[PDB]
Each structure stands twice: as C-alpha cells, then as structure tokens.
Amino acid sequence: PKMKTHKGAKKRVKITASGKVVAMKTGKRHLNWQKSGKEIRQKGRKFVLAKPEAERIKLLLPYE
Amino acid sequence: ASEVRIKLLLECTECKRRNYATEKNKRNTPNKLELRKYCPWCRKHTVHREVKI
RNA sequence: UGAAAUACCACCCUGGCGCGGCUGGGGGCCUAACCCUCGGAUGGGGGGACAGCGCUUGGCGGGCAGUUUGACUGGGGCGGUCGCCUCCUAAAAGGUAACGGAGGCGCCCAAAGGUCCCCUCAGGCGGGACGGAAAUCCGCCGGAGAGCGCAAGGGUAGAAGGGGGCCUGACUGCGAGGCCUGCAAGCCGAGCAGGGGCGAAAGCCGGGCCUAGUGAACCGGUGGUCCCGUGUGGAAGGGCCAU
RNA sequence: GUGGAGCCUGGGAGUGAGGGCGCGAGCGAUAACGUCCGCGUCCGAGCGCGGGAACAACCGAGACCGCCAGCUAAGGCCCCC
RNA sequence: GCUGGGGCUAGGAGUGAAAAGCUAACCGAGCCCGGAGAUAGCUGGUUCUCCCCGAAAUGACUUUAGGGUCAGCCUCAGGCG
RNA sequence: GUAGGGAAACCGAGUCCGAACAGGGCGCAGCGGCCGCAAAGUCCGCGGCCGUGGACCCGAAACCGGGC
RNA sequence: UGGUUCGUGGAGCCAUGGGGGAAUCUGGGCGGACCACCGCCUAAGGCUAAGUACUCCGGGUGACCGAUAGCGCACCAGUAC
RNA sequence: GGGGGGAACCUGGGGAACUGAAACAUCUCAGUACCCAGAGGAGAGGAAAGAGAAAUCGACUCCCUGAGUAGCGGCGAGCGA
Ligand SMILES: [Mg+2]
Ligand SMILES: [Mg+2]
Ligand SMILES: [Mg+2]
Ligand SMILES: [Mg+2]
Ligand SMILES: [Mg+2]
Ligand SMILES: [Mg+2]
Ligand SMILES: [Mg+2]
Ligand SMILES: [Mg+2]
Ligand SMILES: [Mg+2]
Ligand SMILES: [Mg+2]
Ligand SMILES: [Mg+2]
Ligand SMILES: [Mg+2]
Ligand SMILES: [Mg+2]
Ligand SMILES: [Mg+2]
Ligand SMILES: [Mg+2]
Ligand SMILES: [Mg+2]
Ligand SMILES: [Mg+2]
Ligand SMILES: [Mg+2]
Ligand SMILES: [Mg+2]
Ligand SMILES: [Mg+2]
Ligand SMILES: [Mg+2]
Ligand SMILES: [Mg+2]
Ligand SMILES: [Mg+2]
Ligand SMILES: [Mg+2]
Ligand SMILES: [Mg+2]
Ligand SMILES: [Mg+2]
Ligand SMILES: [Mg+2]
Ligand SMILES: [Mg+2]
Ligand SMILES: [Mg+2]
Ligand SMILES: [Mg+2]
Ligand SMILES: [Mg+2]
Ligand SMILES: [Mg+2]
Ligand SMILES: [Mg+2]
Ligand SMILES: [Mg+2]
Ligand SMILES: [Mg+2]
Ligand SMILES: [Mg+2]
Ligand SMILES: [Mg+2]
Ligand SMILES: [Mg+2]
Ligand SMILES: [Mg+2]
Ligand SMILES: [Mg+2]
Ligand SMILES: [Mg+2]
Ligand SMILES: [Mg+2]
Ligand SMILES: [Mg+2]
Ligand SMILES: [Mg+2]
Ligand SMILES: [Mg+2]
Ligand SMILES: [Mg+2]
Ligand SMILES: [Mg+2]
Ligand SMILES: [Mg+2]
Ligand SMILES: [Mg+2]
Ligand SMILES: [Mg+2]
Ligand SMILES: [Mg+2]
Ligand SMILES: [Mg+2]
Ligand SMILES: [Mg+2]
Ligand SMILES: [Mg+2]
Ligand SMILES: [Mg+2]
Ligand SMILES: [Mg+2]
Ligand SMILES: [Mg+2]
Ligand SMILES: [Mg+2]
Ligand SMILES: [Mg+2]
Ligand SMILES: [Mg+2]
Ligand SMILES: [Mg+2]
Ligand SMILES: [Mg+2]
Ligand SMILES: [Mg+2]
Ligand SMILES: [Mg+2]
Ligand SMILES: [Mg+2]
Ligand SMILES: [Mg+2]
Ligand SMILES: [Mg+2]
Ligand SMILES: [Mg+2]
Ligand SMILES: [Mg+2]
Ligand SMILES: [Mg+2]
Ligand SMILES: [Mg+2]
Ligand SMILES: [Mg+2]
Ligand SMILES: [Mg+2]
Ligand SMILES: [Mg+2]
Ligand SMILES: [Mg+2]
Ligand SMILES: [Mg+2]
Ligand SMILES: [Mg+2]
Ligand SMILES: [Mg+2]
Ligand SMILES: [Mg+2]
Ligand SMILES: [Mg+2]
Ligand SMILES: [Mg+2]
Ligand SMILES: [Mg+2]
Ligand SMILES: [Mg+2]
Ligand SMILES: [Mg+2]
Ligand SMILES: [Mg+2]
Ligand SMILES: [Mg+2]
Ligand SMILES: [Mg+2]
Ligand SMILES: [Mg+2]
Ligand SMILES: [Mg+2]
Ligand SMILES: [Mg+2]
Ligand SMILES: [Mg+2]
Ligand SMILES: [Mg+2]
Ligand SMILES: [Mg+2]
Ligand SMILES: [Mg+2]
Ligand SMILES: [Mg+2]
Ligand SMILES: [Mg+2]
Ligand SMILES: [Mg+2]
Ligand SMILES: [Mg+2]
Ligand SMILES: [Mg+2]
Ligand SMILES: [Mg+2]
Ligand SMILES: [Mg+2]
Ligand SMILES: [Mg+2]
Ligand SMILES: [Mg+2]
Ligand SMILES: [Mg+2]
Ligand SMILES: [Mg+2]
Ligand SMILES: [Mg+2]
Ligand SMILES: [Mg+2]
Ligand SMILES: [Mg+2]
Ligand SMILES: [Mg+2]
Ligand SMILES: [Mg+2]
Ligand SMILES: [Mg+2]
Ligand SMILES: [Mg+2]
Ligand SMILES: [Mg+2]
Ligand SMILES: [Mg+2]
Ligand SMILES: [Mg+2]
Ligand SMILES: [Mg+2]
Ligand SMILES: [Mg+2]
Ligand SMILES: [Mg+2]
Ligand SMILES: [Mg+2]
Ligand SMILES: [Mg+2]
Ligand SMILES: [Mg+2]
Ligand SMILES: [Mg+2]
Ligand SMILES: [Mg+2]
Ligand SMILES: [Mg+2]
Ligand SMILES: [Mg+2]
Ligand SMILES: [Mg+2]
Ligand SMILES: [Mg+2]
Ligand SMILES: [Mg+2]
Ligand SMILES: [Mg+2]
Ligand SMILES: [Mg+2]
Ligand SMILES: [Mg+2]
Ligand SMILES: [Mg+2]
Ligand SMILES: [Mg+2]
Ligand SMILES: [Mg+2]
Ligand SMILES: [Mg+2]
Ligand SMILES: [Mg+2]
Ligand SMILES: [Mg+2]
Ligand SMILES: [Mg+2]
Ligand SMILES: [Mg+2]
Ligand SMILES: [Mg+2]
Ligand SMILES: [Mg+2]
Ligand SMILES: [Mg+2]
Ligand SMILES: [Mg+2]
Ligand SMILES: [Mg+2]
Ligand SMILES: [Mg+2]
Ligand SMILES: [Mg+2]
Ligand SMILES: [Mg+2]
Ligand SMILES: [Mg+2]
Ligand SMILES: [Mg+2]
Ligand SMILES: [Mg+2]
Ligand SMILES: [Mg+2]
Ligand SMILES: [Mg+2]
Ligand SMILES: [Mg+2]
Ligand SMILES: [Mg+2]
Ligand SMILES: [Mg+2]
Ligand SMILES: [Mg+2]
Ligand SMILES: [Mg+2]
Ligand SMILES: [Mg+2]
Ligand SMILES: [Mg+2]
Ligand SMILES: [Mg+2]
Ligand SMILES: [Mg+2]
Ligand SMILES: [Mg+2]
Ligand SMILES: [Mg+2]
Ligand SMILES: [Mg+2]
Ligand SMILES: [Mg+2]
Ligand SMILES: [Mg+2]
Ligand SMILES: [Mg+2]
Ligand SMILES: [Mg+2]
Ligand SMILES: [Mg+2]
Ligand SMILES: [Mg+2]
Ligand SMILES: [Mg+2]
Ligand SMILES: [Mg+2]
Ligand SMILES: [Mg+2]
Ligand SMILES: [Mg+2]
Ligand SMILES: [Mg+2]
Ligand SMILES: [Mg+2]
Ligand SMILES: [Mg+2]
Ligand SMILES: [Mg+2]
Ligand SMILES: [Mg+2]
Ligand SMILES: [Mg+2]
Ligand SMILES: [Mg+2]
Ligand SMILES: [Mg+2]
Ligand SMILES: [Mg+2]
Ligand SMILES: [Mg+2]
Ligand SMILES: [Mg+2]
Ligand SMILES: [Mg+2]
Ligand SMILES: [Mg+2]
Ligand SMILES: [Mg+2]
Ligand SMILES: [Mg+2]
Ligand SMILES: [Mg+2]
Ligand SMILES: [Mg+2]
Ligand SMILES: [Mg+2]
Ligand SMILES: [Mg+2]
Ligand SMILES: [Mg+2]
Ligand SMILES: [Mg+2]
Ligand SMILES: [Mg+2]
Ligand SMILES: [Mg+2]
Ligand SMILES: [Mg+2]
Ligand SMILES: [Mg+2]
Ligand SMILES: [Mg+2]
Ligand SMILES: [Mg+2]
Ligand SMILES: [Mg+2]
Ligand SMILES: [Mg+2]
Ligand SMILES: [Mg+2]
Ligand SMILES: [Mg+2]
Ligand SMILES: [Zn+2]
C-alpha cells in the first residue's frame, strides 16, 4: 500500500526549494550557562544536512 | 559547577528581563553579583543583578 | 471625660450556657432489610444493620504472569576495562593497533577576567639582632634551570610571570574565510552595526598561556515574547527567545 | 605525462573472518605456521603456466583462440630428464 | 497384599509413600487443528550462454563484535577536458 | 506542476534572524529562420533498486486459542 | 472505563458499571476545558425497501492446469491406510 | 410459535499469542485468530438532542476522492480520521 510519511522527520526537518534538507543545529537544548554567546547564537541557526543523510531523510517524506 | 559554585542568571535592573547566565563561588562571593551589562531590550548598558537560576 | 459617654430602640461582634434544627463521631439497646436455623415457613428462634455483596481508596502480595539480567576478552567465567586530556610506542607531514609502557580530568577564578602603567626569576657566594639549611634586609654573580591554580607536553621575561589604577568585552546582533571530519559534533576567526571599558594615542577587549574540567534527542520546569487560540471575544494549552 | 587516467552529478553493488612473505616497531622468551600496528608485495580472485623432488602466497611470469615454427626468463645441461 | 468389572479427577491442569515421576512406546508442562507461510542478524540451497570491467576483509559509530549505518574501494549513464 | 521564505501572524521574487536601509541562511533569471527545434512539468509503457506485505526457498526450539 | 485520529493530554463528543439526582419550551443536548455572545439540534419508544457483502448451487468465459500439474480426489476419496 | 441445519458473507457478546518495536513492559500484531449467541437471502445502519463555520448542508448504506492530510504516538516502532 502507499508509503507513510515519517512524522519524526516531518517534525524536525524541511526540504528546501532546490531539494536540500535543512535542520536546526544541535547542542543548545540545555547546559548552556558556560557556553559563550558565540556558541548559543550560532547554534540558533539552520544548517544543511550532508548529502548522504539528506538522501535518506527525503525518501521518508514522499509527499512533501 | 558544584554545590558552592552555583550557576545563576543576570537580570537587567530596569526592564526585569534576564539577559545573561553565568556562575560564581557563593563561599567566596556571598553577596549578589552586580555588573553593568548591555541589555538588548533597553538597548544600552544597565546594572544587572544576580537572580536564582 | 476619653479615641469612643452614657438613660431607652435596634442590629452585630465576643465568649459561654439551656433548648432546639442539621448532622460528625463514639457507648448502649431494638427489629424489620440482610445472613443462619427450625417436621411447622405471611410463622418461631439466633446473629444483625454488622456480616455478605456492588462501586471506589491506599496497602501486603514468586501463589501466579510477562520479561530484563551489556560489551571487550589470546576460549568463556572470575579479575580488569568502557568517555575525555598529556607523553611514548608512531617507522622526522597527518593518521596509526594490542588486556603495550606512564600519568592525569568529571574542577576552578568576581579575579585567577578587560585595559593601562610599572616591575623581573630560581639558584650560588659574602655580609646582618633574636633567626635556623630555609622567614626579612644589603651587596656581587647568575638567559632562564623559577614562575605560569592542578597531569604531562608545547610555549613563555622583548611575558604568558609579580604589583597597582580604572573597570565588567566572562558583550548584543552577525560573520568573510578556514582547521578537522563518515554523520553529527569539535575548533580558529578578521571584519561590519549597537551600546560600552581602558588608553593622550596607536590600539586592545566577544573570559582565563594553550591543549582535559563533559552528555545528542525526547519529556518536563522557570523568566520573557504576545506568534497560534477549533463559530466569535477571551481563556485553556501550544510555538518562538533565554535558562 | 592521453591513461580501462583524473574530476562533477546520479543509478546498482559487493566488502567491513583475511592470509603468507620482506622491511620498521610493540607484545612474547632477541619462542611459535604466535599476536598487534605501519610501508610494500603476492595469494585471496592467477590451486592457470615454468623453476623450487612434491607444495596458495620463494624465484620466473599477468593464460583471447589455433600451429609437429623461432627467441628467452628463473632454473638448468652425467643418467632418470 | 494382589486382581476383574463398573466409575471420577487433565494440560500451568490432574495424579504423585516425591523419581520433576506418570497423564496412550521421547512430558521441566500431553495430543490435534487453528493464529501460521510465527520468528531464525544462523546453516543449507539458488537452475541457459557469450562479451567488457572488476573489488573488500579498513576507518568511525553501534546491548556492537561472524549483524548493521556512513565513508573507502568496484561498476554503469550523463557531463567536464 | 505553475513561488518561495518563516514556528507562526504574515509578507512575497523575495523572506527569515535583526534596531539595520548590516551581514548571512533558504530562494528568484533556451536553439535557430511570427514560425519551426528543443524543453519546466506531467501522463502512460518498459527497466534497475527501495518501502509495506510471507517478499528468494526450505528449516526450528518455542508462544497463544479452541477442542481431543 | 470503553469508542474516536485522540495512549491523561488543554480532553470536549458518543456509550456506561458506582454514587448523587432534575426540569416540559423561558424546557433541554451540541459547536473540543471553561465563561459570555452567536448559531445548530430536539435525548432518554419502535420500524423502514434500494444502492453493499458472500458463493453451497446453475451458466458463461480464459495470453488458466493438463495426471509429480489442476481441488486432497479426472478413476468407487474424505476412500484405503 | 420455538428447538436443529446451511460454503462463505453479516451483526452482537467475549477475545489471544507469536510477531514488530533489531532486547522489553506502555505501544504493536488486533478487536485480528478463535469461542459463543443471533440473523437472512443478505445482515448492519437509517429519517438529526447530526455535521461544523459554509451567513451552510440536510436519513442511512456503498464506491471514488479529500489523504497517508488533520492528528495520535515509550512524538519510538508505528497508528491514522
Ligand atoms: Mg516525532
Ligand atoms: Mg538545540
Ligand atoms: Mg539534550
Ligand atoms: Mg530551549
Ligand atoms: Mg525548548
Ligand atoms: Mg568558561
Ligand atoms: Mg561569550
Ligand atoms: Mg553567556
Ligand atoms: Mg539570540
Ligand atoms: Mg499531497
Ligand atoms: Mg443486641
Ligand atoms: Mg431476626
Ligand atoms: Mg433477634
Ligand atoms: Mg457493611
Ligand atoms: Mg447479594
Ligand atoms: Mg472512594
Ligand atoms: Mg491496591
Ligand atoms: Mg515480587
Ligand atoms: Mg517468574
Ligand atoms: Mg503482551
Ligand atoms: Mg512477548
Ligand atoms: Mg536491559
Ligand atoms: Mg537488566
Ligand atoms: Mg544491562
Ligand atoms: Mg556479546
Ligand atoms: Mg562476551
Ligand atoms: Mg581468557
Ligand atoms: Mg572474540
Ligand atoms: Mg585465540
Ligand atoms: Mg589461546
Ligand atoms: Mg586479544
Ligand atoms: Mg566482571
Ligand atoms: Mg610521533
Ligand atoms: Mg604520532
Ligand atoms: Mg607523526
Ligand atoms: Mg612518517
Ligand atoms: Mg587532514
Ligand atoms: Mg583491558
Ligand atoms: Mg585587582
Ligand atoms: Mg589563571
Ligand atoms: Mg637571591
Ligand atoms: Mg646568606
Ligand atoms: Mg643569627
Ligand atoms: Mg638567612
Ligand atoms: Mg619552568
Ligand atoms: Mg597536581
Ligand atoms: Mg597584572
Ligand atoms: Mg588589573
Ligand atoms: Mg570610570
Ligand atoms: Mg565557514
Ligand atoms: Mg564537519
Ligand atoms: Mg573534543
Ligand atoms: Mg565543548
Ligand atoms: Mg564598537
Ligand atoms: Mg565603541
Ligand atoms: Mg570604543
Ligand atoms: Mg577617552
Ligand atoms: Mg576606540
Ligand atoms: Mg572581535
Ligand atoms: Mg581553562
Ligand atoms: Mg591573566
Ligand atoms: Mg524516546
Ligand atoms: Mg516541550
Ligand atoms: Mg491572537
Ligand atoms: Mg485574536
Ligand atoms: Mg474561540
Ligand atoms: Mg467582551
Ligand atoms: Mg486575559
Ligand atoms: Mg500563552
Ligand atoms: Mg536557548
Ligand atoms: Mg579500470
Ligand atoms: Mg545505471
Ligand atoms: Mg542492478
Ligand atoms: Mg552493505
Ligand atoms: Mg559484508
Ligand atoms: Mg564487523
Ligand atoms: Mg574485522
Ligand atoms: Mg579473522
Ligand atoms: Mg583480527
Ligand atoms: Mg591485519
Ligand atoms: Mg612479515
Ligand atoms: Mg634480506
Ligand atoms: Mg618484526
Ligand atoms: Mg610499536
Ligand atoms: Mg635463546
Ligand atoms: Mg599468523
Ligand atoms: Mg614470525
Ligand atoms: Mg614477530
Ligand atoms: Mg599484508
Ligand atoms: Mg573469500
Ligand atoms: Mg602468482
Ligand atoms: Mg593479482
Ligand atoms: Mg601460483
Ligand atoms: Mg595454487
Ligand atoms: Mg609453482
Ligand atoms: Mg614445480
Ligand atoms: Mg619438477
Ligand atoms: Mg608451491
Ligand atoms: Mg604454505
Ligand atoms: Mg592478458
Ligand atoms: Mg635458443
Ligand atoms: Mg640463468
Ligand atoms: Mg638436477
Ligand atoms: Mg639428456
Ligand atoms: Mg479393580
Ligand atoms: Mg473400566
Ligand atoms: Mg478401575
Ligand atoms: Mg482427570
Ligand atoms: Mg481426584
Ligand atoms: Mg480434558
Ligand atoms: Mg500445558
Ligand atoms: Mg494448551
Ligand atoms: Mg505454556
Ligand atoms: Mg504409589
Ligand atoms: Mg496419542
Ligand atoms: Mg504420552
Ligand atoms: Mg509414556
Ligand atoms: Mg516416559
Ligand atoms: Mg513450556
Ligand atoms: Mg480448529
Ligand atoms: Mg500472524
Ligand atoms: Mg516455521
Ligand atoms: Mg507474519
Ligand atoms: Mg526471536
Ligand atoms: Mg533462485
Ligand atoms: Mg581485467
Ligand atoms: Mg591488504
Ligand atoms: Mg574494520
Ligand atoms: Mg556514529
Ligand atoms: Mg558503545
Ligand atoms: Mg547503547
Ligand atoms: Mg567499539
Ligand atoms: Mg550476529
Ligand atoms: Mg556503502
Ligand atoms: Mg576511485
Ligand atoms: Mg577505477
Ligand atoms: Mg558510484
Ligand atoms: Mg561515464
Ligand atoms: Mg575520457
Ligand atoms: Mg504546488
Ligand atoms: Mg512553511
Ligand atoms: Mg521576531
Ligand atoms: Mg538575503
Ligand atoms: Mg545566497
Ligand atoms: Mg516535446
Ligand atoms: Mg516527457
Ligand atoms: Mg534504491
Ligand atoms: Mg504477508
Ligand atoms: Mg512466513
Ligand atoms: Mg514471499
Ligand atoms: Mg522483495
Ligand atoms: Mg514441547
Ligand atoms: Mg508470550
Ligand atoms: Mg514465555
Ligand atoms: Mg507461557
Ligand atoms: Mg484448552
Ligand atoms: Mg465518565
Ligand atoms: Mg477514555
Ligand atoms: Mg482509549
Ligand atoms: Mg498530549
Ligand atoms: Mg477525548
Ligand atoms: Mg452511569
Ligand atoms: Mg456521560
Ligand atoms: Mg431553548
Ligand atoms: Mg434551559
Ligand atoms: Mg448529551
Ligand atoms: Mg455532556
Ligand atoms: Mg454541534
Ligand atoms: Mg458544552
Ligand atoms: Mg468552542
Ligand atoms: Mg446540531
Ligand atoms: Mg424498493
Ligand atoms: Mg433490510
Ligand atoms: Mg440493499
Ligand atoms: Mg455478486
Ligand atoms: Mg463454474
Ligand atoms: Mg490443452
Ligand atoms: Mg499419474
Ligand atoms: Mg493428483
Ligand atoms: Mg504422462
Ligand atoms: Mg492438488
Ligand atoms: Mg471435484
Ligand atoms: Mg481406491
Ligand atoms: Mg436457524
Ligand atoms: Mg464484537
Ligand atoms: Mg448475548
Ligand atoms: Mg470486549
Ligand atoms: Mg485469554
Ligand atoms: Mg506481546
Ligand atoms: Mg506480521
Ligand atoms: Mg517493522
Ligand atoms: Mg521484539
Ligand atoms: Mg527484533
Ligand atoms: Mg527476546
Ligand atoms: Mg487495538
Ligand atoms: Mg467478534
Ligand atoms: Mg476468518
Ligand atoms: Mg436460544
Ligand atoms: Mg443458528
Ligand atoms: Mg441483494
Ligand atoms: Mg433490518
Ligand atoms: Mg433497526
Ligand atoms: Mg424521527
Ligand atoms: Mg490535497
Ligand atoms: Mg488500532
Ligand atoms: Zn533592560
């Protein structure tokens, strides 16, 4: 039967207009007091997943 | 960080918002930290005060 | 006269008493629900509003049920080990294994941080009350063998070492370009803007001589924000920023 | 330097038990067809061919098919040959 | 005490002067049908021909270590030159 | 499929972070002589591989239900 | 407690085992806690074709099988054993 | 009038486990297998105390779509209007 959308992927990740997979940087959910303002600021941005991992995630989103 | 080396927040004294997290040794420093920091809401430097984390 | 001032009329406090409603407990009795029993049963006898049983609360509970009970390893078990830092092994780029050889981390500092100004060690010899191998003082020699919070290595006085003054850049908003690299992480970073610190200034400042001092998600807390709000306005509860 | 070279994008893998030898070390006993790395090589997949009495990995050499033709390699040239 | 006939007790259950004994010739949980083609990171097996290329047994991480994901190495198509 | 960016309100060849008119992230643009050629995209056929099913085939020891 | 996409979630709705327990239209249920506004609907009685499912049975037809195939059985088969 | 029977289909009352989550308990397999009661050529459902945002629609059943959407979920595996 028809493939199901993986909802863990759908909730964490976005496929961009050209087919990149963009996610939120990790590492700032907690334990942030002794992290420089540089670490916190930069971890607040989106990044582009490396191609091998992006190809896997995209197959999980067959209808995006 | 330990039982005597606590983490804490710095609260802008004018607009009340907590803008900074840091640490101190409460044996060496029993009194509240007071430090002039740049507050991005007031957009200027302000005395910030130690507050419970 | 005090703050208030009187006889009498209320209403209400105070705290208690006697009646009463309404129950909350307890003690005693009763009989009729309910239970037991009796050649007799629309009855008599016994128990009795308990016990049994229904719903719900917490508790004890291998009698039973489903399972869990790590890996490496000169076989397995036992012992040891599991992440991170330093040195060697490592064959002069990088990287490189063994239950190979040695150590250390799971902290700390409100200054042990920024800037400005100043200062220079250990050690050896001679000399000086108590005062010594070694306390403090004076001279001469002494490039770094001292110091740099803590392992080791690198680095270092033309300071990163010692002292003082003013300070909070132990910034907010970003970030060219790179190191490293399977991912995800880790690392370095000029410069631009906001508002500052020190300095006459050139300038420096996004913690600490550097390399360990750490933990991805999920779930939840707290402070902001005022973005969503299930017909509508709110609210409930979410999101976003910070921890 | 034109090579079954290199680079970019994408489709399909398989492999993640290696092993011997030479050199450089550690471990072991300046032991092991021992073990664990590094550089290389061959076997693996060339148990096809010549030599080494026989013999994956030593020496020689990379088998498209055929020939009762010639030259060589290592190794050999008394006989088995 | 032994024995005939007639009866009752069974599967997490019986029965057991206790051996986990016996419950229809294998009982630490009977047999049959069914869920059912359970599941098996294990072992085995996998069928015509010819042509070209042609690996790996490493690294990281892994309740991981004879299994995997990614990278490395092979192969095909397009492109670059 | 023809628009993307943002958690979203929303805005839109832009948008998000931001005080920024700063910087960055993710985005935005045919060949020939009106024509032919080609193409975004999409539809169908064919083929490789993937997902869901027992999913290349055979094989447990077992677990459960209902009966004997 | 169950049903629903809803596994306690902000948890409404529909169903109900236990306890409490109404009203007759100005009555009552719903629009996802709740309150207001605005709308929708009329619970606690019952019935109702057709369109849908299946294939013991009859027929029609196959880029379905052809006796190890096709039903377990082409034949005296749910038989012998 | 009832009783019993009928391949499969249907409704109601009860209701697993292997398995998947590369262990496992919530979760999944699944209200499936299966037992039982009842129905009939069908059964169930059915004439709004409906939907839910349309100032709207207008019983029920069934197919296509909406849609693997909205959501649910040790926010895992998966489930799924
Ligand atoms: Mg999720
Ligand atoms: Mg994060
Ligand atoms: Mg975390
Ligand atoms: Mg956070
Ligand atoms: Mg958060
Ligand atoms: Mg720090
Ligand atoms: Mg900082
Ligand atoms: Mg900070
Ligand atoms: Mg920020
Ligand atoms: Mg779609
Ligand atoms: Mg009495
Ligand atoms: Mg009595
Ligand atoms: Mg009595
Ligand atoms: Mg009682
Ligand atoms: Mg009773
Ligand atoms: Mg109660
Ligand atoms: Mg209890
Ligand atoms: Mg117990
Ligand atoms: Mg047990
Ligand atoms: Mg279970
Ligand atoms: Mg199980
Ligand atoms: Mg466990
Ligand atoms: Mg355990
Ligand atoms: Mg364990
Ligand atoms: Mg093991
Ligand atoms: Mg083991
Ligand atoms: Mg051993
Ligand atoms: Mg082993
Ligand atoms: Mg061995
Ligand atoms: Mg041995
Ligand atoms: Mg070993
Ligand atoms: Mg042990
Ligand atoms: Mg070295
Ligand atoms: Mg080295
Ligand atoms: Mg080296
Ligand atoms: Mg070298
Ligand atoms: Mg490199
Ligand atoms: Mg060991
Ligand atoms: Mg000072
Ligand atoms: Mg220091
Ligand atoms: Mg001296
Ligand atoms: Mg002296
Ligand atoms: Mg003296
Ligand atoms: Mg002296
Ligand atoms: Mg020194
Ligand atoms: Mg020390
Ligand atoms: Mg100083
Ligand atoms: Mg100073
Ligand atoms: Mg001043
Ligand atoms: Mg960069
Ligand atoms: Mg990287
Ligand atoms: Mg690191
Ligand atoms: Mg770090
Ligand atoms: Mg400035
Ligand atoms: Mg300035
Ligand atoms: Mg300035
Ligand atoms: Mg000045
Ligand atoms: Mg300046
Ligand atoms: Mg700077
Ligand atoms: Mg430090
Ligand atoms: Mg310093
Ligand atoms: Mg989880
Ligand atoms: Mg949360
Ligand atoms: Mg709003
Ligand atoms: Mg509003
Ligand atoms: Mg509303
Ligand atoms: Mg209002
Ligand atoms: Mg309000
Ligand atoms: Mg809110
Ligand atoms: Mg944060
Ligand atoms: Mg080639
Ligand atoms: Mg291809
Ligand atoms: Mg293929
Ligand atoms: Mg593979
Ligand atoms: Mg393999
Ligand atoms: Mg392996
Ligand atoms: Mg291996
Ligand atoms: Mg091996
Ligand atoms: Mg090995
Ligand atoms: Mg090896
Ligand atoms: Mg060797
Ligand atoms: Mg030699
Ligand atoms: Mg050697
Ligand atoms: Mg060595
Ligand atoms: Mg010897
Ligand atoms: Mg060997
Ligand atoms: Mg050897
Ligand atoms: Mg050796
Ligand atoms: Mg080798
Ligand atoms: Mg092999
Ligand atoms: Mg050879
Ligand atoms: Mg070869
Ligand atoms: Mg050979
Ligand atoms: Mg051979
Ligand atoms: Mg040979
Ligand atoms: Mg020979
Ligand atoms: Mg010979
Ligand atoms: Mg040989
Ligand atoms: Mg040999
Ligand atoms: Mg050849
Ligand atoms: Mg000749
Ligand atoms: Mg010769
Ligand atoms: Mg000879
Ligand atoms: Mg001769
Ligand atoms: Mg007898
Ligand atoms: Mg008998
Ligand atoms: Mg008998
Ligand atoms: Mg019996
Ligand atoms: Mg008995
Ligand atoms: Mg029985
Ligand atoms: Mg049994
Ligand atoms: Mg049984
Ligand atoms: Mg059993
Ligand atoms: Mg007996
Ligand atoms: Mg039998
Ligand atoms: Mg038996
Ligand atoms: Mg027997
Ligand atoms: Mg027996
Ligand atoms: Mg058993
Ligand atoms: Mg059966
Ligand atoms: Mg099954
Ligand atoms: Mg089987
Ligand atoms: Mg199955
Ligand atoms: Mg299993
Ligand atoms: Mg086959
Ligand atoms: Mg070839
Ligand atoms: Mg090799
Ligand atoms: Mg390996
Ligand atoms: Mg990894
Ligand atoms: Mg591990
Ligand atoms: Mg683990
Ligand atoms: Mg490992
Ligand atoms: Mg395995
Ligand atoms: Mg691969
Ligand atoms: Mg290559
Ligand atoms: Mg190649
Ligand atoms: Mg490729
Ligand atoms: Mg090509
Ligand atoms: Mg070429
Ligand atoms: Mg579209
Ligand atoms: Mg969006
Ligand atoms: Mg904003
Ligand atoms: Mg832009
Ligand atoms: Mg750009
Ligand atoms: Mg065309
Ligand atoms: Mg086309
Ligand atoms: Mg594929
Ligand atoms: Mg299946
Ligand atoms: Mg199967
Ligand atoms: Mg299959
Ligand atoms: Mg398949
Ligand atoms: Mg058995
Ligand atoms: Mg089980
Ligand atoms: Mg079991
Ligand atoms: Mg069992
Ligand atoms: Mg049974
Ligand atoms: Mg309820
Ligand atoms: Mg419920
Ligand atoms: Mg439920
Ligand atoms: Mg929830
Ligand atoms: Mg609900
Ligand atoms: Mg009720
Ligand atoms: Mg209710
Ligand atoms: Mg009304
Ligand atoms: Mg009313
Ligand atoms: Mg109601
Ligand atoms: Mg209600
Ligand atoms: Mg409604
Ligand atoms: Mg309501
Ligand atoms: Mg509402
Ligand atoms: Mg309505
Ligand atoms: Mg009709
Ligand atoms: Mg009908
Ligand atoms: Mg009909
Ligand atoms: Mg029909
Ligand atoms: Mg027929
Ligand atoms: Mg025929
Ligand atoms: Mg025959
Ligand atoms: Mg036959
Ligand atoms: Mg025949
Ligand atoms: Mg047959
Ligand atoms: Mg027949
Ligand atoms: Mg016969
Ligand atoms: Mg009947
Ligand atoms: Mg049912
Ligand atoms: Mg019934
Ligand atoms: Mg039920
Ligand atoms: Mg059961
Ligand atoms: Mg289960
Ligand atoms: Mg299954
Ligand atoms: Mg699965
Ligand atoms: Mg499992
Ligand atoms: Mg599994
Ligand atoms: Mg298991
Ligand atoms: Mg279920
Ligand atoms: Mg049923
Ligand atoms: Mg069935
Ligand atoms: Mg009946
Ligand atoms: Mg019947
Ligand atoms: Mg009909
Ligand atoms: Mg009917
Ligand atoms: Mg009806
Ligand atoms: Mg009606
Ligand atoms: Mg759609
Ligand atoms: Mg379900
Ligand atoms: Zn402020």
Handedness of CA A29, A34, A35, A37 (dihedral sign): positive
Task: Round to whole Å and give the CA distance between A44 and A9.
Answer: 19
DSSP letters, B15-46, are T--EEEEEEEETTT--SPPEEEEEETTTTEEE
The A 29-58 residues near strand D by Cβ under 7 Å are 51, 55
Token pair 């197959």 in the structure block, residue: A59
Separation of CA A51 and C1' E40 in angstroms? 35
Question: Cα–Cα distance between A48 and B48 in angstroms, integer?
Answer: 37
Q: Is the CB of A64 under 7 A from strand D?
A: no
Method: X-ray
CB B11 within 8 A of CB B18: yes
**Reported resolution, Å:** 2.4
Q: Which nucleotide is nearest to B22 (CA to C1')?
A: C170
